[PDB]
Design a protein around this nucleic acid. Structure first.
Ligand SMILES: [Mg+2]
Length: 755
RNA sequence: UUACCAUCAACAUGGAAACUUGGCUC
RNA sequence: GAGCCAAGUUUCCAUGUUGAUGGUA
């Protein structure tokens, strides 16, 4: 609505592409009615049809979504319409009952605007798959694996600070043209006796979609004794056969009467949904196709859209709307007019942050990546590693030997005084050799700095066991190396340099720093990791900078009980982190910068109105401690795609471009920042919502601080999407949620052990 | 699990509106 | 009746990370 002033001073203007705008409003008022269909029919197709047949009284200018109706003229307080079914001529009483009077400029009409856009861009003959609409005629077919890809648009009208836009982005829906009945026919041809077990093992857990009501269901069972000539209850105590339920109530003809039923039992809601495999289709790239290089090469090439290809598909949508007379008529009866082009803005590109080291402080590039620029110069703090151990199994003499030999080669210009390791052979590849050898060597020798292990293949139970032994049982920093990582000796120097910098990091060593312009500040990140497999323990990692250069990050994790508020545990995280800051800096920080992750748009008021008051009131566990807290909420935000205006076309945006208007929300002071270097696709800018700013921060200074903290991540040698404490607390939350399952030892918490 | 980034297949959570059901209720 | 709680359905959305392919360092 109102144009907030969030713009800064520095940075270079950059012309950017965007989404679409059309609702310069000309309708007078919208009247929202609820429609009751007696007897009950749930299919939106002929429900929309019979509401169109009462155009004499309802008008021709409607907006319908099955149960909620919108007019621009006010009817009576109830209307009893008479309709006849197109199938069996059943007299159906329609009850047009006025529920709401919506002003068209308000945010209550955003679902109505979305319903009328799904109307107009459904009138382009684009089919409904999942949430979005996809072109079935501009498709591309992969007949070697029975797929089609439909290039469509996830399009939603949303009101932002610069106006009330249509966010359209180019999605690509993967439609498996073979139905679950057709896939079962293919399996029945492929497998004769064990067709039932193989189709069960492929099908259960996997996701099908019914296209008539476009609902996705996880197959939880297949029942073969049931057959759709049998009857089921239509929601009010009425038996009806499935062919009658799909012909009388859905209008379409079931061809095969021998097919089984698909059972999706929801979360405990409770009721066995029975589905038809003729009208169920699988979704997903097939398992015989992912290993094929060519098919996924075409699929990847055509979903990796350049900004020219993305804007070309959006302007194809615009031209299809404008060239269609009935679609432009259906949009313009509500006073809505689409623009001739996608919206454009003038964002700003943030300046390049200098990466500092021990002796050589260097500015970055336009690429914003310093892989080569950091492994030939001295790191700012390398503690020397003499007594370390390296563990390798029986089939890994050569790769481990060249790993340590090349490590001794590259540790010269990096600045690590590495010694030859303990050459620990591992007898085999189970838990009770690796784990037992590590703690038995750890008990005898108390001067081990870093334990490095080599794992063959990719396993989660063993890596969890090494990190469980090295974080909560025997506190020692540990590094885990894959053996397919070290398979190629060609590009092995850069990855061995990154491994050496990672073992420098886990030992408490410092890699690089950025020039923080403000003083005496404490940067904090958390990340709630919501648990879907252990019973709702939203484990809160917590990473807090404890020095003036923001290179030492003391981290604590707190576990949360189900339906337990985060008061008594995030209070402990804050008081422990301020106590650690009191030991190190011997004063108190004048600013605390907090970055939140794991927040949807409906939890913004909960975060801003419950959790920041409880943290600012839990700051009173010290004497007269009232700092200047700043809270940010981070959201990757994969809906928006910025383009860049090359003098002929649209190119990928430069790393570090920010936009702080016209897509931003009206209720907060916030922005979208593209920090990393994106080389394929359009980049995904990250939404940073300032729910609290007690420090009187500048509009420019949060951009520079969030970008400087995007440089600050020591596990990737360039800029990254989220800030460094966001990814630190993110991996800390993964460690404590999926790997450790319990808070780590405190003596490791002075270092970045989780990297 | 040396990373990071794109996009796809999903699942899960949360918000808002309308309706329905069951308790309270001036 | 006004209002609140709880649950469901239907619309509209939003976020997250699970698995994949890729990319380059
Ligand atoms: Mg998260």
């Amino acid at each position: 609505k109102e144009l907030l002033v969030k713009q800064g001073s520095k940075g270079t203007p950059q012309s950017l592409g965007l989404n679409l705008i059309k609702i310069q409003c000309h309708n007078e008022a919208v009247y929202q009615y609820h429609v009751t269909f007696s007897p009950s029919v749930e299919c939106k197709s002929m429900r929309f049809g019979m509401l169109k047949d009462h155009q004499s009284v309802t008008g021709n200018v409607t907006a319908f979504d099955g149960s909620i109706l919108y007019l621009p003229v006010k009817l009576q307080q109830v209307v009893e319409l008479k309709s006849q079914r197109k199938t069996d001529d059943a007299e159906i009483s329609i009850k047009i009952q006025l529920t709401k009077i919506l002003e068209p400029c308000s945010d209550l009409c955003i679902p109505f605007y979305n319903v009328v856009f799904r109307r107009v861009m459904k009138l382009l003959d684009m089919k409904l798959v999942g949430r979005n609409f996809y072109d079935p005629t501009s498709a591309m077919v992969l007949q070697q694996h029975r797929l089609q890809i439909w290039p469509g648009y996830a399009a939603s009208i949303r009101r932002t600070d610069g106006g009330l836009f249509l966010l359209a982005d180019v999605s690509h829906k993967v439609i498996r043209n073979d139905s679950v009945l057709d896939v079962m026919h293919a399996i029945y041809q492929q497998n004769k006796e064990h067709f039932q077990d193989e189709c069960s093992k492929l099908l259960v857990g996997s996701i099908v979609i019914t296209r008539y009501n476009n609902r996705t269901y996880r197959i939880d069972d297949v029942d073969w004794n049931k057959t759709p000539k049998d009857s089921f209850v239509m929601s009010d105590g009425k038996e009806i056969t499935f062919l009658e339920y799909y012909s009388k109530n859905y209008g379409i003809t079931v061809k095969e009467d021998d097919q089984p039923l698909l059972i999706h039992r929801p979360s405990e809601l409770k009721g066995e949904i029975l589905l038809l495999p003729e009208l169920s289709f699988m979704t997903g790239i097939p398992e015989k196709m992912k290993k094929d290089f060519r098919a996924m090469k075409d699929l990847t090439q055509q979903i990796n859209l350049s900004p020219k290809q993305h804007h070309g598909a959006l302007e194809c949508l615009l031209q299809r709307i404008s060239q269609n007379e009935t679609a432009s008529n259906e949009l313009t009866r509500w006073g809505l007019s689409l623009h001739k082009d996608v919206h454009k803005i003038e964002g700003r590109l943030l300046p390049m942050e200098r990466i500092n080291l021990r002796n050589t402080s260097f500015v970055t590039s336009e690429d914003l990546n310093w892989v080569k620029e950091v492994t030939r110069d001295a790191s700012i703090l390398t503690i020397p590693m003499h007594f370390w151990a390296l563990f390798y199994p029986k089939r890994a003499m050569d790769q481990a030997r060249e790993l340590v030999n090349m490590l001794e080669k590259i540790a010269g210009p990096i600045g690590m005084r590495i010694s030859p390791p303990a050459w620990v052979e591992l007898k085999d590849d189970r838990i009770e050799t690796y784990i037992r050898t590590i703690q038995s060597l750890l008990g005898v020798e108390g001067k081990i700095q870093m334990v490095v292990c080599i794992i063959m293949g990719t396993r989660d139970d063993l890596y969890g066991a090494i990190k469980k032994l090295c974080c909560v049982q025997s506190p020692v920093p540990s590094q885990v190396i894959n053996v397919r990582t070290i398979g190629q000796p060609t590009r092995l120097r850069s990855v061995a340099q990154k491994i050496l910098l990672q073992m420098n990091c886990k030992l408490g060593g410092e890699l690089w720093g950025v020039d923080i312009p403000l003083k005496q500040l404490m940067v904090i990140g958390m990340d709630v990791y919501h648990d879907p497999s252990r019973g709702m323990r939203s484990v809160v990692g917590f990473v807090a900078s404890i020095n003036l250069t923001l290179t030492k990050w003391y981290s604590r994790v707190v576990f949360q009980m189900p339906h337990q508020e985060i008061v008594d545990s995030l209070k402990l995280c804050l008081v422990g982190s301020l106590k650690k800051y009191y030991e190190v800096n011997h004063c108190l920080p004048e600013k605390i910068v907090v970055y939140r992750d794991g927040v949807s748009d409906g939890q913004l008021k909960t975060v801003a109105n419950y959790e920041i008051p409880q943290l600012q009131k839990c700051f009173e566990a010290f004497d007269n401690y009232h700092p200047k807290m700043v809270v940010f909420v981070v959201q990757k935000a994969i809906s928006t795609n910025l383009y860049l205006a090359a003098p002929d076309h649209f190119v990928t945006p430069s790393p570090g471009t920010v936009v702080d208007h016209t897509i931003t929300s009206c209720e907060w002071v916030d922005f979208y920042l593209l920090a990393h270097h994106v080389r394929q696709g359009c980049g995904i800018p990250t939404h940073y919502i300032c729910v609290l700013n007690t420090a009187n921060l500048s509009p420019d200074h949060m951009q520079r601080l969030t970008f400087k903290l995007c440089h600050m991540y020591w596990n990737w040698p360039g800029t990254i999407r989220v800030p460094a404490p966001c990814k630190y607390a993110h991996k800390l939350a993964f460690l404590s949620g999926q790997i450790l399952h319990h808070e780590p030892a405190i003596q490791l918490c002075g270092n970045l052990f989780f990297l």
